[PDB]
Design a binder for this molecule. Structure first.
Ligand SMILES: CNC(=N)NCCC[C@H](N)C(=O)O
Ligand SMILES: O=C(O)CCC(=O)C(=O)O
Ligand SMILES: [Zn+2]
Length: 236
C-alpha cells in the first residue's frame, strides 16, 4: 500500500471533514512536537519521577502467544530487567494509565485540540502509556474508540487495515478476542489465511513528535524499532 499522510497542524475543520468523519488515518506534524515530554523524557527522568511506582508488565513477544503473561513490578525493575540489562524476554509496560497514577507525568503532555471535535467529555478520555524496549509487538487488533497515538521516544513501524477488510483479517472466534486478528502481519500463514494477502493497507514509521490518528475500529499493528515510549489518547 501507501504511506499514511502527514499534515502540519491542520485546522480543526480540515481534520474533521477529511479524516474524522470519513474515518481516514493521518499523521499530524507540528502538534505534539514541543510538548515538554519530547525533550524531558528519558530513562533517567522516568526513573527519577516514576521508578518507585508499581506498574503492570506484559511478558512475551505477542499477547496472542500461549506462553504470554502479565505481572507486576516497579518502573525501575522494568527498565532494569527488560531494557538495559540484556533482556532475556520481551517485557512491555503497555496500556497502563500511567498518568492517572503519576499526575506529575501528565504535566508533560496535553489533550490534543482535535479531541473536542467528538461527543465525549475531556476527562472521560483514556490516556495510556506504552513503554518498552526495541522489538515489542502489538498484534493486529481494533479498538472501540478514536485514537491519537503520540510518539515520544524511539520509532514504531505501524500497519493499518480498514474495518472493511475485516474479513481478510480472520478475527478470533471467541468474543473475548474477536477484536484481535489471527494473522501474524509480518509473517502471515497464507496457507491458513489466504485472503490476508490481497487486503490493501496503509503503513508508516512513526517518529518522535508525530501523532498517529487511528480512526475508531481501524485495525492497527505496532512494532517498536527502538527503545520506544508512546502515549495513546482514546476519545469519542
Ligand atoms: C497493544 N499491545 C499490547 N501488548 N497490549 C494491550 C492489548 C490489549 C488491547 N486489546 C489493545 O490492543 O488495546
Ligand atoms: O503502540 C502499541 O504497541 C499499540 C498501541 C495501541 O494498540 C493503541 O494505542 O490503541
Ligand atoms: Zn490499540
Amino acid at each position: 500500500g501507501s504511506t499514511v499522510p502527514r499534515l502540519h497542524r491542520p485546522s480543526l475543520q480540515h481534520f474533521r471533514e477529511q479524516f474524522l468523519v470519513p474515518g481516514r488515518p493521518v499523521i499530524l506534524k507540528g502538534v505534539a512536537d514541543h510538548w515538554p515530554c519530547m525533550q524531558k523524557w528519558s530513562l533517567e527522568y522516568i526513573q527519577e519521577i516514576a521508578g518507585c511506582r508499581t506498574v503492570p508488565v506484559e511478558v512475551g513477544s505477542r499477547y496472542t502467544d500461549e506462553e504470554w503473561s502479565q505481572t507486576l513490578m516497579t518502573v525501575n525493575e522494568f527498565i532494569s530487567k527488560y531494557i538495559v540489562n540484556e533482556p532475556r524476554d520481551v517485557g512491555y509496560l503497555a496500556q497502563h494509565q500511567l498518568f492517572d497514577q503519576i499526575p506529575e507525568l501528565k504535566q508533560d503532555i496535553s489533550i490534543p485540540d482535535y479531541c473536542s471535535l467528538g461527543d465525549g467529555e475531556e476527562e472521560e478520555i483514556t490516556i495510556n502509556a506504552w513503554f518498552g524496549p526495541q522489538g515489542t509487538i502489538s498484534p493486529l487488533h481494533q479498538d472501540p474508540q478514536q485514537n491519537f497515538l503520540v510518539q515520544v521516544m524511539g520509532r514504531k513501524y505501524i500497519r493499518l487495515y480498514s474495518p472493511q477488510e475485516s474479513g481478510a483479517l480472520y478475527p478470533h472466534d471467541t468474543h473475548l478476542l474477536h477484536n484481535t486478528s489471527q494473522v501474524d502481519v509480518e509473517n502471515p500463514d497464507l496457507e491458513k489465511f489466504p485472503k490476508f494477502a490481497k487486503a490493501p493497507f496503509l503503513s508508516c514509521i512513526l517518529s518522535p513528535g508525530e501523532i498517529l490518528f487511528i480512526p475508531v475500529k481501524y485495525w492497527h499493528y505496532v512494532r517498536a524499532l527502538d527503545l520506544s515510549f508512546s502515549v495513546s489518547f482514546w476519545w469519542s
